[PDB]
Design a protein around this ligand. Structure first.
Ligand code: OQE
Ligand code: OQE
Lengths: 227, 20, 228, 20
């Protein structure tokens, strides 16, 4: 029962068993229809946590490796590669759901932006640990997805919509952390932040909490990047 | 938590420290 | 597929990356090569499984609390909790296996025997907490008996300020109070351990100072809370 | 150490609470 995968997910969330949560929402997604906004939020939180645990581990192992003997430095690399291969499996799973179910079934323009952003993200996460030819593919595919979302975001949503704001936040991180373009990063973020200030008026009760957090984050990032 | 701003600052700072 | 030095050291890396399942799998493997364990190794082992088991116990309590809130909605709290319960019984049985086949059988010096006997009490304690009435009498009784035997050895062969002796008293007291609902016992057990340790606070070894005082503070934390 | 002790208290407290 779908309504039931869904409450397995909610339970797994509460218990902090994010791998269970993701596999449930993956099964819901494979049932082929458009996701409710609540199902879509659960899927996204599930996988953000599942991939973030691994990226965090990957970062820890990598920090240790620089900090450093050979037999040890080698097991550092082997353990990182075990983490890398889980990251690739997590992200491929999500990008396949995006490619086959969520982006094709995405009718409302705010859905297509959300999922194209999600594809930019998971291709960004692949890029953070990719090598050589495959890095260029991942980085290119992440920018394509972000940009396609960032053009629909301007034609269909206001500068205060939390999905438009989140896309600007994450695209700015892509420029800063993946393309290594601090200036393109800091401008994308400032613009989106100023554009939403100059129309704070517009924030429906329902959007207020989320959009303000994202603008706080956009400003926290800009503050940090001018340091 | 809504340790979100803190955890995000920690995350963005990592890239700065560990990729100069 | 590798060597003690190698596995021990992916165990440390797994710890820092907080991948405790990886960490416990690493130390299970070093345990099975049968070679008896450093203090360093024994502790990485204990830490790995305490976190592995601890995650499932925390999750079980979360899911339990929620079941205390639809014939099939609650049918799922029940199915999910039982998924966790099964994970938790598997973890405990894997650790119980290693204890009975490898660690207790080679426990040469009394420090080690007490340590692993406590673990046996600990992991039968955790089985008891979700155990199904049939076993629950047996996991309790296994738990008390592992603990009592560690208790006996530790009173005769270790200082009141040894951190292993104190941690055992901490967990045995917890066992009385939370498994055998005998606060009078648990409380008396925790008081005597704290009291006999502080009495010998002039020969508390420097090496042990941080751990033994932490455990003494937790005994005091739990005595205070068990009297509220 | 404060972290350790407070996690312990939360853990022991859950018992006095959710199964009294
Ligand atoms: O903590 C982080 C950044 O670090 C990460 C850690 C784990 C997974 C992904 C990421 P990211 O895509 O690179 O940002 N929060 C940023 C995401 C966010 C958006 C809106 C509201 C709240 C938070
Ligand atoms: O956090 C807890 C209690 O709760 C748990 C949580 C996870 C797994 C097991 C347990 P426990 O065996 O029932 O006590 N610390 C108590 C044990 C301790 C001894 C010495 C130093 C520090 C702590």
């Amino acid at each position: 029962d779908k309504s039931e995968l869904v409450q397995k997910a909610k339970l797994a969330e509460q218990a902090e068993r994010y791998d269970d949560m993701a596999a449930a929402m993956k099964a819901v997604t494979e049932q082929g229809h458009e996701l409710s906004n609540e199902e879509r939020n659960l899927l996204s939180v599930a996988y953000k946590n599942v991939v973030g645990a691994r990226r965090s581990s990957w970062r820890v192992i990598s920090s240790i490796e620089q900090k450093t003997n050979e037999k040890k430095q080698q097991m550092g690399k082997e353990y990182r590669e075990k983490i890398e291969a889980e990251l690739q499996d997590i992200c491929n799973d999500v990008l396949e759901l995006l490619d086959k179910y969520l982006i094709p079934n995405a009718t409302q323009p705010e859905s297509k932006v959300f999922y194209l952003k999600m594809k930019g993200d998971y291709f960004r996460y692949l890029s953070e640990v990719a090598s050589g030819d495959n890095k260029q593919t991942t980085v290119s595919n992440s920018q394509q997805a972000y940009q396609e979302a960032f053009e629909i975001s301007k034609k269909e949503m206001q500068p205060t919509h939390p999905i438009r704001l989140g896309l600007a936040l994450n695209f700015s991180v892509f420029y800063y952390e993946i393309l290594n373009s601090p200036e393109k990063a800091c401008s994308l973020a400032k613009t989106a932040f100023d554009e939403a200030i100059a129309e704070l008026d517009t924030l429906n009760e329902e959007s207020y909490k989320d959009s303000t957090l994202i603008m706080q984050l956009l400003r926290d990032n800009l503050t940090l990047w001018t340091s | 938590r809504d340790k979100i701003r803190l955890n995000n600052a920690i995350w963005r700072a990592w890239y700065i420290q560990y990729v100069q």
